[PDB]
Amino acid sequence: NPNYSFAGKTSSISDLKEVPRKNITLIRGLGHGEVYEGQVSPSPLQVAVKTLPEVCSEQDELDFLMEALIISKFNHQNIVRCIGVSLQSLPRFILLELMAGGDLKSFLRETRPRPSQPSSLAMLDLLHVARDIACGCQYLEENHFIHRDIAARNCLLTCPGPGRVAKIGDFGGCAMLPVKWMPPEAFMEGIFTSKTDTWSFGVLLWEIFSLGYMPYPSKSNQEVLEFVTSGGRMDPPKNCPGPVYRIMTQCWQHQPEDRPNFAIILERIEYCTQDPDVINTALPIEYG
Ligand SMILES: COc1cc(Nc2nccc(N3CCC[C@H](C(=O)NCc4ccc(C)cc4)C3)n2)cc(OC)c1OC
C-alpha cells in the first residue's frame, strides 16, 4: 500500500470506492490492459471498465493501483471521472466515465469534411474542443499537476454528435517518449513545469486544426528533437486562421517563461471564438 498526495490530501488504496463485482456487467470491448463498455447495477450506470491482466508483473500491479488513486482525486468536468474500482476480484477493474465519442484523434480523422459529408465539422467545433481541454489543463495546472502527454490520442469525447465535450482521459532507450509533444527543455534538464503542458497543448492545437494529422509529418522522433531544439516550428495546418496559429507559436516559445499559462490560453481561445473571420473560415475538404 503506497500513499498518494493531491491538493495536500493524502489517500491510499482503502479510500477508493470499491464496487461489488456482482454489480458490474461487461457489455462489449472498446480497446486495449483492455477496456470494455460496462454497466453498474432499472436505471443502471453505464461505464467504461479498464482491466488489469491477471498475469502481469509486480510493477504492472503497482502502476494500475497508483493510476486509480490519481484519477479518483481529480474532480473536474473536463477530466474523465473514476466511478470506482473493483480490486478485490480478478481481474481487477477501474471504472471510468464512459466516453461514447471515443478518442479525439480518431474522431477528427473520421469526421473530416468530405464530398460525402461536407459540413461535418466547423471551426467553432474545433475551438470548443480546444477550450474544453484548455479548461482541464488549467485545473491540472492550478492543482500543481503536470500531465506530460497532452495529445489528441489522450483526449476523449462524451458523445459523437453535437453537444460533445472533450475531456482529458488518458495518461502517456526512449522510443516510447512522446517526443513530438515535448518542449526543448524536457530533453535538456529533463525538468517539468506546467509550461511543459503549455507546449504540448500547442501541439494538440495543431493536431485539432489539422483534423487529426500526425505532428511533423515527415520527421522521426530524433529529427523532431533536433528540429525543435534548433528553433524549428510547424507550419500552420491547412486553412488555419492566423489568430489560431499565433496561439500555437506562443505555446512553442523556446523559453518556458515566454509561454502563456492556461488562463491566458483560454482568453485567447475565447477571442478567436468571438472573431467572425476566424469561425467563418471553411475547413479543407479532403477528397473522397
Ligand atoms: C466509441 O468507442 C470508444 C469509446 C471510448 N471511450 C472510453 N471511455 C472511457 C475510457 C476509455 N478508455 C480507453 C482509452 C484509455 C482510458 C484510460 O485508461 N484512462 C485512464 C485515465 C487517465 C488519466 C485521466 C485524467 C483519466 C483517466 C480508458 N474509453 C474510447 C475509444 O477509443 C479509445 C473508443 O473507440 C473504440
Side-chain angles (χ1 to χ4, degrees):
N1 173 40
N3 294 19
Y4 173 72
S5 315
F6 180 76
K9 188 183 166 178
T10 308
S11 56
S12 61
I13 184 167
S14 55
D15 297 324
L16 297 169
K17 313 290 167 188
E18 181 79 10
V19 175
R21 183 54 60 103
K22 68 166 87 278
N23 291 169
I24 309 158
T25 322
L26 306 176
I27 295 157
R28 66 175 61 88
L30 295 175
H32 55 268
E34 47 202 335
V35 184
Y36 296 92
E37 177 185 347
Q39 56 181 240
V40 179
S41 307
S43 64
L45 177 70
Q46 54 160 191
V47 295
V49 190
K50 188 183 186 163
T51 78
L52 173 72
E54 285 199 68
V55 179
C56 69
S57 55
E58 178 186 280
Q59 190 62 229
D60 284 335
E61 286 260 4
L62 272 167
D63 292 346
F64 190 82
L65 171 66
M66 195 56 75
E67 204 187 14
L69 295 166
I70 298 160
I71 307 155
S72 297
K73 298 329 291 170
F74 294 146
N75 167 37
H76 193 275
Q77 63 268 28
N78 300 111
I79 298 172
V80 322
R81 305 293 180 161
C82 178
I83 272 79
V85 298
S86 171
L87 307 182
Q88 297 174 22
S89 290
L90 293 161
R92 312 199 218 278
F93 294 162
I94 293 165
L95 314 166
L96 303 166
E97 173 180 8
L98 180 64
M99 305 294 287
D103 75 280
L104 178 57
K105 186 182 168 69
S106 303
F107 167 83
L108 294 163
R109 288 156 84 85
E110 293 161 349
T111 324
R112 277 173 194 168
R114 278 161 191 166
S116 62
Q117 286 159 223
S119 59
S120 55
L121 281 161
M123 282 296 175
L124 205 59
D125 297 291
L126 306 180
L127 291 164
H128 285 172
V129 170
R131 166 254 263 147
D132 287 350
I133 298 306
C135 198
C137 290
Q138 182 192 42
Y139 169 86
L140 295 185
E141 173 197 284
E142 279 171 350
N143 287 283
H144 321 289
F145 192 96
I146 306 155
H147 187 277
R148 294 160 157 263
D149 197 13
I150 298 294
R153 71 186 157 256
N154 294 323
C155 301
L156 308 184
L157 300 153
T158 48
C159 61
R164 69 182 78 77
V165 179
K167 306 191 183 200
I168 299 166
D170 205 352
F171 292 124
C174 306
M176 288 187 68
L177 282 187
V179 176
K180 299 182 190 198
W181 290 263
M182 290 185 291
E185 76 273 4
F187 313 96
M188 225 60 81
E189 265 9 87
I191 295 309
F192 290 79
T193 62
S194 290
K195 294 296 170 84
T196 292
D197 284 347
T198 294
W199 181 287
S200 305
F201 186 85
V203 182
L204 167 65
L205 273 179
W206 190 94
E207 283 187 285
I208 287 162
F209 283 82
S210 74
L211 304 167
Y213 278 90
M214 176 67 62
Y216 314 90
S218 301
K219 288 168 173 58
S220 65
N221 274 8
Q222 180 64 25
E223 288 169 340
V224 173
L225 206 176
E226 304 174 11
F227 183 69
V228 160
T229 297
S230 70
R233 301 294 179 266
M234 275 183 289
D235 285 325
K238 189 170 180 171
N239 294 357
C240 189
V244 178
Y245 184 63
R246 297 185 225 116
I247 305 177
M248 295 178 210
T249 60
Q250 286 292 293
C251 289
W252 303 328
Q253 282 302 294
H254 191 98
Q255 266 87 75
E257 303 72 26
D258 290 344
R259 300 169 198 158
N261 62 29
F262 285 100
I264 298 303
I265 289 169
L266 283 159
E267 295 193 344
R268 294 179 182 164
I269 292 169
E270 282 316 280
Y271 205 74
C272 287
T273 292
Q274 290 186 304
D275 193 334
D277 290 346
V278 170
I279 65 178
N280 285 318
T281 309
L283 283 170
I285 300 160
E286 187 180 61
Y287 188 62

